[PDB]
Design a protein around this ligand. Structure first.
Ligand SMILES: Cc1cn([C@H]2C[C@H](OP(=O)(O)O)[C@@H](COP(=O)(O)O)O2)c(=O)[nH]c1=O
Length: 129
């Protein structure tokens, strides 16, 4: 896999899911995670967590997997990195998302993320508390 550059595009409502990739705006959806929505338990914590990670990054990169690059909603499907640190993994490791949506072809980092979840569960973090 390859990391490619992006930048955060500021949103009116403060969300940090839209990135500028090859010069164009694109909503990205993080591969391999289920992230609680704002109104669910740990929703506000997960949003604050990703927001701090992406907004403070000097460098954002996106990394496509080997399969589909966009979903049925037109969202980019990628591993998102903030100064070399993967957002998808960091959410899971902190118990702020679960490993989920594992489709064929786009599963390169599955075992890496499942290890993070196992560690988060062992430590009773957040969702696992
Ligand atoms: C993570 C991921 C989600 N999706 C689709 C599955 C779900 O479709 P449905 O909308 O029909 O439930 C949806 C979950 O996204 P959200 O968790 O952002 O709601 O996005 C993909 O198609 N591929 C993916 O890799």
């Amino acid at each position: 896999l390859h990391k490619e550059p992006a930048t955060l595009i500021k949103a009116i409502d403060g969300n940090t899911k839209k990135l500028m990739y090859k010069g164009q705006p694109m909503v990205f959806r993080e591969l391999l995670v289920d992230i609680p929505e704002f109104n669910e338990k740990y929703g506000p914590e997960a949003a604050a967590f990703t927001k701090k990670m992406v907004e403070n990054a000097k460098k954002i990169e996106v990394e496509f997997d080997k399969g589909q690059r966009t979903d049925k909603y037109g969202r980019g499907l990628a591993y998102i990195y903030a100064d070399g640190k993967m957002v998808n993994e960091a959410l899971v490791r902190q118990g702020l998302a679960k490993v989920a949506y594992v489709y064929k072809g786009n599963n390169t980092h599955e075992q890496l993320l499942r290890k993070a979840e196992a560690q988060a569960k062992k430590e009773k973090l957040n969702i696992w508390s």
